[PDB]
Structure 1
Amino acid sequence: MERCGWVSQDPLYIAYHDNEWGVPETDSKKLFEMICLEGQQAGLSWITVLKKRENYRACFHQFDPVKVAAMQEEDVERLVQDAGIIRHRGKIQAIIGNARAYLQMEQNGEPFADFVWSFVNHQPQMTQATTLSEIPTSTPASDALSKALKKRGFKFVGTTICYSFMQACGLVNDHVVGCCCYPGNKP
């Protein structure tokens, strides 16, 4: 039985595959971090951002979305030189805007995980696909997620962004069915 296609690609994916390929329930806090790195995969590769995730968290190690809304262009100007993360003040400015949207949901008292888990009916989704090509990049819950986050002023939420986010968050199980031991049979 084979595990995952991008897993045999290199040890870095093996760590991410074993760290949490959507197996644990997600918290509203991690939901914000995931949509942040997940948004960068637009046109870019997930591994390209993965390396930047290590450097990016180093500078953004504040894990405090409120301060992120306080991070202005002056901060992105110096950060492009901090560790040499993905130099791109433009896309980084979008990240700061994402924080203001985070406060918008809080002003509404609605946690990110609350409405997301609600889209999947607070229940896990079993994918009957067999290969990555058989994996859907646009599901009703993923499509509903992008339009919803887009309304909150959340940028970088393409249809693949919503689907890729649920894939690793834990809302759905769909590596490719048969990934070494895909659950959902008798468990």
Structure 2
Amino acid sequence: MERCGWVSQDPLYIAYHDNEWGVPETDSKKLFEMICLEGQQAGLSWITVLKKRENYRACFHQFDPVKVAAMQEEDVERLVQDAGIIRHRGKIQAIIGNARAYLQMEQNGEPFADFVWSFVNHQPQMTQATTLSEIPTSTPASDALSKALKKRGFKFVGTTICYSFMQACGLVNDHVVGCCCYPGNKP
């Protein structure tokens, strides 16, 4: 049958495509883990981030999110000893800050995950592009969303990382018209 052309090879990526990718997520932890790890793709390929994504969980998932917000600069330097993932004490520091800004949003009982949803009018977006080139990476919500995270102090929010967030987060549905799941004319 027809399938998404986003993947050229690497069977691991396709498995990730079927697992989620394009499925709207409302979990704050899933969105936080996506925006933080997505920064790794910068310069690196999407496949590189997925492999390290699993290793990243080994160093951060066990510590949980609230803990990093409660960790000190010595903790990031201590784990740096293990580089199973890209090495960059500066990037690790962003993780601690990510939990600090994220935790502040919860203090008002308003998850920051709900905030991004409001940027798209709490309404899901869908597209019927035929080729990947037809899909535009410049959208009014993606540009405004990056400015919002930048204000929070989030790093690695380039417009490219922002568009990737909606793609993995599922805010927008971009699976061309040859992915079976996306018909475009078959209700």
CA 1:117 to 1:17, structure 2 compared with 1: closer, same or farther past 3 Å?
same
Deviations for 1:121-142, whole angstroms, at most 9, x for unmatched residues?
Answer: 2222111322222222221111
Measure, in 2, the Cα distance between the counterparts of 1:62 and 1:36: 16
**Do 1:142 and 1:162's aligned partners in 2 also have CA atoms closer than 8 Å?**
yes
Instruction: Please report the RMSD computed on the Cα atoms of aligned residues, expressed in angstroms.
Output: 2.0
**Do 1:6 and 1:13's aligned partners in 2 also have CA atoms closer than 8 Å?**
no
| Deviation, structure 1 residue 169 | 1.1
SS at 2:61 equivalent: coil
What is the TM-score when the length of structure 2 is the normalising length? Answer: 0.88
Measure, in 2, the Cα distance between the counterparts of 1:68 and 1:81: 17
Deviations for 1:142-177, whole angstroms, at most 9, x for unmatched residues?
Answer: 111110111111111111111111111121101223
Deviations for 1:76-95, whole angstroms, at most 9, x for unmatched residues?
Answer: 22323336221111221122
**Do 1:127 and 1:177's aligned partners in 2 also have CA atoms closer than 8 Å?**
no
Measure, in 2, the Cα distance between the counterparts of 1:183 and 1:69: 43
Measure, in 2, the Cα distance between the counterparts of 1:32 and 1:127: 25
CA 1:69 to 1:18, structure 2 compared with 1: closer, same or farther past 3 Å?
same
| Deviation, structure 1 residue 24 | 4.3
Equivalent positions of 1:1-187 (< 5 A) are: 1-62=1-62, 64-82=64-82, 84-183=84-183, 185-187=185-187
Percent of aligned pairs sharing the same letter:
100
Bigger mean CA deviation after superposition, 168-177 or 67-76:
67-76
**Do 2:145 and 2:162's aligned partners in 1 also have CA atoms closer than 8 Å?**
yes
Measure, in 1, the Cα distance between the counterparts of 2:79 and 2:159: 29
| Deviation, structure 1 residue 183 | 4.7
Paired residues, number: 187
| Deviation, structure 1 residue 35 | 1.0
SS at 1:60 equivalent: helix
For structure 1, which runs of at least 5 residues remain unmatched after alignment?
Answer: none
Measure, in 2, the Cα distance between the counterparts of 1:32 and 1:184: 31
What is the TM-score when the length of structure 1 is the normalising length? Answer: 0.88
**Do 1:55 and 1:83's aligned partners in 2 also have CA atoms closer than 8 Å?**
no
**Do 1:79 and 1:85's aligned partners in 2 also have CA atoms closer than 8 Å?**
no
**Do 1:65 and 1:102's aligned partners in 2 also have CA atoms closer than 8 Å?**
no
**Do 1:80 and 1:86's aligned partners in 2 also have CA atoms closer than 8 Å?**
no
CA 1:77 to 1:63, structure 2 compared with 1: closer, same or farther past 3 Å?
closer
